[PDB]
Amino acid sequence: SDDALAFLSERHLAMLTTLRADNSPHVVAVGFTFDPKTHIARVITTGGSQKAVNADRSGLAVLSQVDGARWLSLEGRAAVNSDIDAVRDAELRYAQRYRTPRPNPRRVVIEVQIERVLGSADLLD
Amino acid sequence: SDDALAFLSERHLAMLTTLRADNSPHVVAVGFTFDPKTHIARVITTGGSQKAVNADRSGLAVLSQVDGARWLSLEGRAAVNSDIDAVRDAELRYAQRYRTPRPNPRRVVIEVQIERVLGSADLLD
Ligand code: NA
Ligand code: NA
């Protein structure tokens, strides 16, 4: 829905859930971006972070955002992309929502192909 | 830390992460309470909810709260308690942070024994 898309444009952090090797959830705050056309969500991080290692190793992620009583969780399949062009593009998408990220040659992108969306009733449909 | 305890008293929702049978994370917004003395976090829900089924079946949960740049994730071992006295007590703890919950004879409590805390640097130590 359009209210959902506006919510996803607001400047807030979200929680990224990935799985550790033992299947325990690792849940940490991140910024993210969401492309409504492709359904790809992106998190930028430094290579080798626990987020990146978990996303690469287990292949899934959830991004969960809440403000007041409004919330969404976006679930999907995750991979890590270290291609320089992909990283630049993700940095610019990030800047579009947040602000210009600090330069970091070690930056990688966690790309999540969203399959399922849960959320508050005011944001679904 | 004391700033962490104050953060955990503020009236905000949080995300509860549990695992589905297939190990995919189920992440939905909840209110919760946290007892600093016992390290028990509590979520009230209607019996048979996906949260309750996942907590009972897989035995783990994470509660994650974010406001602005401040955040905490509380990880631990989860169980479902349907004892009437436990439910009343959890309802009152909930009311202490939020407001009196609607009467519901089917209410159960997800009790999470917190083992690990992650968060923003301003809240740890
Ligand atoms: Na960091
Ligand atoms: Na509900």
Q: Determine whether the interchain pair B75/A23 forms a contact, defined as Cβ–Cβ distance below 8 Å.
A: no
Contact A93, A35 (CB under 8 A): yes
| Residue A81 structure tokens | 């992309």
The ranges assigned to domains in chain A are 1-125
Sign of the C-alpha dihedral, residues B14, A111, A84, A57? positive
Structure's resolution in angstroms: 1.6
Contact B96, B33 (CB under 8 A): yes
Q: Determine whether the interchain pair A25/B25 forms a contact, defined as Cβ–Cβ distance below 8 Å.
A: yes
Q: What is the CA radius of gyration of chain B?
A: 14
Alpha carbon distance A13, B72 (integer Å):
12
Mutation target for A interface from B24, B77, B117, B118: give the one with most A CBs within 10 A.
B24
| Residue B1 structure tokens | 């830390």
Chain breaks in chain A (C to N over 2.5 A) after: none
Which 22-41 residues of chain B touch chain A by CB within 8 A?
A: 23-25, 27-29
From the candidate CATH numbers 3.30.1330.10, 3.40.250.10, 2.30.110.10, 3.50.50.60, the one assigned to the domain spanning B1-125: 2.30.110.10
Ligand nearest A31 Cα, by number?
1
| Residue B45 structure tokens | 């829900």
Which is nearest to A104 in space by CA: A81, A79, A87, A121? A87
| Residue B21 touches chain A, beta carbons under 8 Å | no
